[PDB]
Symmetry: D2
Subunit: 294 residues, 4 copies
């Protein structure tokens, strides 16, 4: 019985759908969601913050600090994974694509890592890719130069934070391996396949097997899907020796037309994993697997 | 005996290595190389132009026109495939990555397609990707927004030119399929996998099989590799029902320490294809396969 | 939400382990187990009979008839799948392997199909293979000549019984396809991969994907595993578009050191399928999928 | 540049087609064919003998001895691989399949290995399978019990002969691995996939990749095909890190309607291997790769 690491991505930064009656928006709600996920058996909480007003995207370090302070004082333990995918948002000017439209948010390393400096989570997410992306109807470019990624990786090492290397393609996996080569990735490397995001690798078993075989043998890997692909990709990862992820960041629905809580999503995934003869890693078990000190 | 389409990529725009004693630099040399490839059995010639002085990169429409005029008046027929990968070259300013360094060459659609308007080749190459790339020691970003790609595709349709959709990932293949969906790709779609370029999909059999299975059934596909992977990837594509590509654009060497001509590379590939029980499409046969009018 | 056909293999003919306190031995117990499986949501019951005394192997048509009569009069409906793997049991004489030891049970078609004639189930299992096999510590040869298989297939057609073509290798799948070619397989063909039996194809995702791709597009397929592989292979089949099988024939344990009932195994599989966004076919739904008349 | 081991299977025991004007029939012709293959660059010769009259199947040890004596005294070196697939030929009596028809040739270990005792080749072929087989229009059963295979393996060890473990399925590969487990396979294990024989694994890239991944990492492996699949499977094996096989045993034709010599087949394969950037192992190089003493 392998112990499967389960991460709950509690809110994300995709647009708030106010028909969802319990979407975590405020830092208190987001912390509450981490605790709820923990109590349902989650190993790790993946955390974004939202504009506490509008439910819109935010990268305010003050908000991150409040979330971490709340979870840490909750009386419930869970490994914290803070998003660091922020500040890579490029909108080329159609009149001259050499130029970034003002709504772009492409910011330097020092600013990108400010929240990490303040909060010191065990893990932070790093999207090790540049590419054409889509969020809903919104088309943009994710701009993470290998130069910037190298600098980020180095900062994480310095801060004692383990990156979760988020990959959208085999090419991305190769670059992750290059980071490792270059001495920029400490201990047990962590890779996660983002599946079914446009214009990245699709959510299929074939994709998962192919990409898995490119990942270093000494690394831990995970894979996840979005919406209706969330549960299938979770089971498929478990079956292939990977770790897993669920949460409202990736899927709002328990079933067709029925909104989920984070806890419910965790409970469902846990049930599947157990029924398949495995179990879900406690936070401390996950730390041990990942070589994180207790 | 399937007829395999063989494209010879005669020069490219990678830096000129002057130890190579017959590198095609001038339009006359480049045309001569197309003819040499044709005579050796190539179906298609993939053409770049170089600064006739320096052997450096160029996208001068005047040079393209001279090459096409020369090949067309040579007395030898071959399908022409002009590069249109040009003008997507982004070098983010390290001091502010929202800004493009002056050495960047990111130009509008109308300028990108000028040479195509003048030369009217049967085929032109379109790199349907945005990503972190490497050429030698040089790291940069290829910036081809889906917006720009849609506009390009439309221009090709208008001009009666078939795009060769160059893909570096499964995600890229998905976007190609989206173009088809959107009515932006006429007739028989053409896909080609670029393998072993950093930070794209690697040159492996597994990569080729996986990506092939994402390509539409009604499409023609090719795959190629670079350097020592050129001949292996050619054979592997032939074996899997794909078309093939060789040439000095991709590999300078016939063998270890021995420089090749384009003709020699074509001859080698042709020999392999024939020995495997297949044959190399004549230009007219390739036109028929691709649904190009004669 | 695909409707997944779930077959419960209620007892089998592997040696009775009397530590299992509810193993179905008598025809009444075996019928009871079919009904229990149905009530838990099973689409189909796969039935063997046992020597009602000893719990040993049997192919007594009288026992088969009692089971079918009981299930059919139970007030609960389920599609019946009777084993017809019987009478192919060869034990070569070590002193002269051209000769069959007396303990062998290799019998003619007419005798093999007697129970089918009497019971007229909708489905019967046909092991379309000859090979070296292992049951526990017992090594033997399964002897099903293509000649015999052709004759069997023909008898099933005549009797209006759909064969479930049990396959242990890709070669076996090819022969199934040959049967179809030869007009010996009516309507929707049914294939099932037996995984992890020695010396057949192993229980891996890779095996399942590879073999699946050899199965005709118009066919229904299933895959199952033994013991600790039962639940993983069930989930993996569901994920890949196949149908599934559980039951005490294949696995005695709910968990480590804890014996299962057939109902419990069905319930577990059903829960997984539902959690993955699918559902389990009712008997009538399964009939419709398989093109069996109601 | 990997050194690829190339075996030439010079005649086999498939029915003599007398339209082939140079088919090796007599021991002198068969030896001559081994020498011809060697001179063209073959590493190994795979040898059967034929009834010197009729060109029909034979396992006469006297004939084997003459062939080996001739090759060894030829002045040309090549590794010898004698068939030991003989004596496993079962034709079940249709009137009672428990009984072997008189035309069957199922013989004991001691007789099966007589030629090996006399000739002491470096290698001998062992078909580690029982199954339904087809040769032309002839359907039969290959009967090699795991008991017999274990005894054979042991005899080879005693005689200092390396078995080439011939596999038709993944199940067969598993049993090969069991032999290794049991201490019945010395040094470097040798596996070869027989592809496209009915009713075994087909000649596809997918088959080769799948089966390759089941083979132990420390083992040498080969794969071959029949007829029109001979050259494709050779190239595909070379590309995947396997060794290769050609010869008149497997294919009579150089091209459509044109008969080949063994030398021509070797020359063609060698040319392909070299063009792909590899080379063909000399006999001594092949010995070194296989851990055979010189
Ligand atoms: Ni996130
Ligand atoms: Ni180019
Ligand atoms: Ni059964
Ligand atoms: Ni042979």
């Amino acid at each position: 019985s392998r112990k499967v690491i389960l991460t709950c991505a509690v809110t994300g930064n995709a647009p708030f759908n106010p028909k969802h009656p319990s979407m975590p928006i405020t830092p208190a709600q987001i912390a509450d969601a981490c605790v709820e996920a923990a109590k349902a058996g989650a190993s790790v909480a993946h955390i974004h913050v939202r504009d506490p007003k509008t439910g819109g995207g935010s990268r305010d370090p003050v908000l991150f600090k409040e979330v971490v302070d709340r979870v840490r004082s909750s009386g419930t333990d869970i490994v914290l994974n803070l998003t660091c995918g922020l500040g890579a948002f490029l909108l080329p000017d159609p009149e001259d694509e050499s130029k970034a439209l003002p709504e772009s948010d492409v910011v330097p390393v020092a600013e990108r890592v400010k929240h990490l400096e303040d909060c010191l989570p065990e893990i932070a997410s790093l999207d090790i890719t540049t590419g054409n992306q889509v969020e809903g109807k919104l088309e943009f470019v994710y701009l993470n130069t290998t130069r910037t990624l190298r600098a980020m990786a180095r900062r994480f090492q310095e801060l004692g934070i383990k990156p979760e290397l988020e990959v959208f393609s085999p090419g991305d996996i190769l670059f992750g391996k290059q980071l490792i080569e270059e001495g920029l990735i400490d201990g047990v490397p962590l890779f996660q396949m983002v599946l079914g995001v446009l214009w990245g690798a699709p959510a299929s078993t074939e994709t998962m097997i192919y990409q898995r075989n490119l990942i270093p043998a000494n690394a831990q890997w995970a894979a996840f899907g979005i919406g209706r692909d969330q549960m299938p990709m979770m089971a498929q990862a478990a079956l292939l020796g990977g770790n897993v992820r669920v949460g409202l960041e990736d899927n709002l629905y328990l079933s067709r037309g029925v909104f989920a809580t984070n806890g419910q999503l965790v409970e469902r995934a846990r049930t599947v994993i157990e029924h398949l003869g495995m179990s879900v890693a406690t936070p401390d078990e996950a730390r041990d697997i990942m070589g994180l000190s207790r």
